[PDB]
């Protein structure tokens, strides 16, 4: 008992004195707590920059035991929302470094798919590189762009697969190429970023007609979202 | 944008006496400004006059 | 599972609680050496040791 | 040694015990390349968050005003459901528009969509 | 140069696996890479009094880069020193390294 | 199930001998409290202690 008077067993009495030697408070926490849904709804956007640092880079001066970063590095992040699903897809992230010679961004890694030139968008940039933040914004908002243009006609196509106005489609993943498939008729239709630009019907029926096939072509041009509505009046005119 | 603020979905009332609304809202801001003036200089209500004008006038 | 977890979460938890013991007591140690002016010192009594091996 | 770095930590200890390529745990300093750079006047409000425990729902309201001009700014208001268990979430609806963009931004509600009409504000 | 807890030893296995491999848990025995290469020419330059400074390094083997990270694991060579390229970066690109950065070799 | 295993016999392994100087570090508060001077002691006196660690135990 002696030495239990000298010794502190204040940590055991209370559990609030056990804690922090085990960390985060309950002050800090709800302090903290508020910032991560404030950064939720900043990706709300869907064009973020984010701080990222080389491992190998590194180096350390010696002088007083600070860490500095010899080339500064800065990281994109493109997130798209889908209408259907209500839900965000698969992130995609675009990565720069910083030369050390004419201080200039230059393209390290990024995870956008092949068919997306993103190399081809960098050299666009006035200078041919990047100097500023505000430049990097027009690169990054552009990719995000095309991102949006590409999965955008892929659910509209899906959306009418699931209202049963067409049957069974395949359909590749810049969904250009689109199996059409409604009916006895087989139509295959090449379709331009958020147009269409080129249709093809290639069953032809006995009393299909050559003429028939040239204007169904026609009638089934215009824009994406107009081909449903065209797509009830055609062929409510094959049936009738 | 009208056809929802009209509540009664026509406008053919609106277009006849909306000059009738501006006649009778100018004249009648006109004896406002007139007991302001007597009653005071009124310099803060003229600068907030202004700076509504200006607001007006942005957008 | 869990009670399997919920028994390792008891093993640090007096670990960390001891090991706060162990520094106290290891720094209990430390006010000693400069209470004491040399730290060469006589044989302990034996009645002394008798109460530590009283001492439960 | 060993260390355990949480989500506030100092810049100099962060540094020192990574060795791996991810992105920065220090919070405050990811808010600042965020805010600051990404997004320049602008400000991002959120008013309350409360928690629906039946159905493990939470209700979102947050207020954002652009300061791109000083002498005419104008605030919106959105409120939104998540279903704070998977992506998905209910619904979304605005409580109010700034009465000087009031006509600009009904165009905004025929398209229907979070990002297009947030973007589109911004830009 | 100069050169045991159990717990610091399962880090430094742990260090080895982010670095060839990018996860912790790895994705695909273990030390088997996502992506097997057979063959890898590098070539360094570097400037040293004024003057351009060169090394050629030639692999041969089944995995190269999978090979490397046992090396890490039996303490041969310094994982912190370990750069980009031959941490197993441009996978199956035989290029040349100028000034910290890496060129396709065509 | 057998992560959980060999991650408690260690377990079991580093609480058991820092149990142990945890009785004999605090023995010595005991000691040297009402003798400041005397830190050092015979051998018996010092296994006849661990004598009592033994029972203990």
């Not at chain 5, 159990?6 to 990018?22: A, S, T």
């Amino acid at each position: 008992p002696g030495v239990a008077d000298l010794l502190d067993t204040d940590i055991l009495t209370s559990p609030s004195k056990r804690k922090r030697k085990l960390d985060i408070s309950t002050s800090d926490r709800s302090e903290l707590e508020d910032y991560i849904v404030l950064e939720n709804v900043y990706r709300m956007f869907g064009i973020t920059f984010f701080p990222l640092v080389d491992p190998i880079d590194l180096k350390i001066k010696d002088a007083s035991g600070e860490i500095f970063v010899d080339r500064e590095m800065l990281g994109i992040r493109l997130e798209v929302f889908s209408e259907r699903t209500s839900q965000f897809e698969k992130p995609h992230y675009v990565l720069l470094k910083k030369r050390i010679k004419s201080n200039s961004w230059f393209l390290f890694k990024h995870t956008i798919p092949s068919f997306i030139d993103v190399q081809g968008i960098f050299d666009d940039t006035n200078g041919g590189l990047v100097i500023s933040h505000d430049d990097a914004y027009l690169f990054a908002k552009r990719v995000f762009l095309q991102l949006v243009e590409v999965q955008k006609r892929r659910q509209i196509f899906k959306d009418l697969e699931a209202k049963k106005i067409i049957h069974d489609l395949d359909l590749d993943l810049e969904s250009s190429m689109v199996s059409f498939f409604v009916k006895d008729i087989k139509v295959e239709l090449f379709v331009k970023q958020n147009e269409i630009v080129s249709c093809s019907i290639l069953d032809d029926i006995h009393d299909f007609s050559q003429n028939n096939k040239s204007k169904w072509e026609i009638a089934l041009l215009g824009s994406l979202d107009d081909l449903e509505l065209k797509l009830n009046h055609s062929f409510a005119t094959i049936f009738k | 944008s009208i056809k929802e603020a009209s509540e009664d979905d026509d406008i053919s009332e609106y277009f006849a006496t909306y000059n009738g609304k501006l006649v009778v809202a100018l004249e009648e801001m006109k004896l406002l400004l007139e007991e302001a003036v007597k009653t005071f200089g009124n310099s803060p209500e003229k600068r907030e006059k202004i700076k509504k004008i200006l607001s007006e006038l942005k957008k | 599972k869990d009670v399997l977890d919920v028994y390792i979460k008891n093993l640090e938890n007096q670990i960390g609680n001891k090991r706060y013991f162990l520094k106290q007591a290891q720094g209990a140690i430390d006010e000693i050496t400069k209470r004491s002016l040399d730290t060469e010192g006589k044989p302990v009594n034996s009645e002394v040791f008798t109460e530590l091996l009283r001492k439960p | 040694r060993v260390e355990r770095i949480n989500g506030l930590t100092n810049l100099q200890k962060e540094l020192v015990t990574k060795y791996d390529t991810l992105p920065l745990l220090n919070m405050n300093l990811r808010l600042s390349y965020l805010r600051d750079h990404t997004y320049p006047h602008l400000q991002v409000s959120v008013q309350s968050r409360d928690r629906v425990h039946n159905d493990g729902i939470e209700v979102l309201v947050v207020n954002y005003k652009f300061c791109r001009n000083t002498m005419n700014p104008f605030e919106i208001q959105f409120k939104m459901f998540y279903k704070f268990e998977d992506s998905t979430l209910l619904k979304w609806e605005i409580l109010r528009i700034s009465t000087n963009v009031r006509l600009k931004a009904k165009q905004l509600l025929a398209t229907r969509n979070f990002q297009k009409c947030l973007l589109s504000l911004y830009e | 140069l100069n050169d045991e807890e159990p717990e610091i030893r399962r880090l430094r296995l742990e260090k080895n696996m982010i670095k060839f491999k990018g996860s912790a848990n790895g994705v695909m025995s273990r030390y088997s890479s996502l992506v097997p290469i057979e063959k890898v020419g590098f070539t360094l330059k570097n400037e040293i009094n004024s003057r351009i400074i060169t090394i050629k390094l030639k692999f041969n083997g089944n995995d190269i880069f999978g090979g490397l990270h046992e090396l890490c694991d039996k303490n041969l060579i310094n994982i912190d020193k370990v750069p980009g390229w031959l941490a197993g970066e441009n996978g199956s690109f035989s290029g040349t390294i100028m000034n910290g950065d890496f060129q396709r070799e065509q | 199930s057998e992560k959980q295993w060999e991650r408690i016999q260690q377990l079991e392994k580093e609480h058991v001998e820092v149990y142990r100087e945890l009785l004999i570090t605090l023995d010595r508060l005991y000691l040297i409290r009402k003798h400041n001077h005397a830190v050092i002691l015979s051998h018996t006196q010092q296994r006849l202690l661990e004598i009592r660690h033994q029972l203990q135990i």
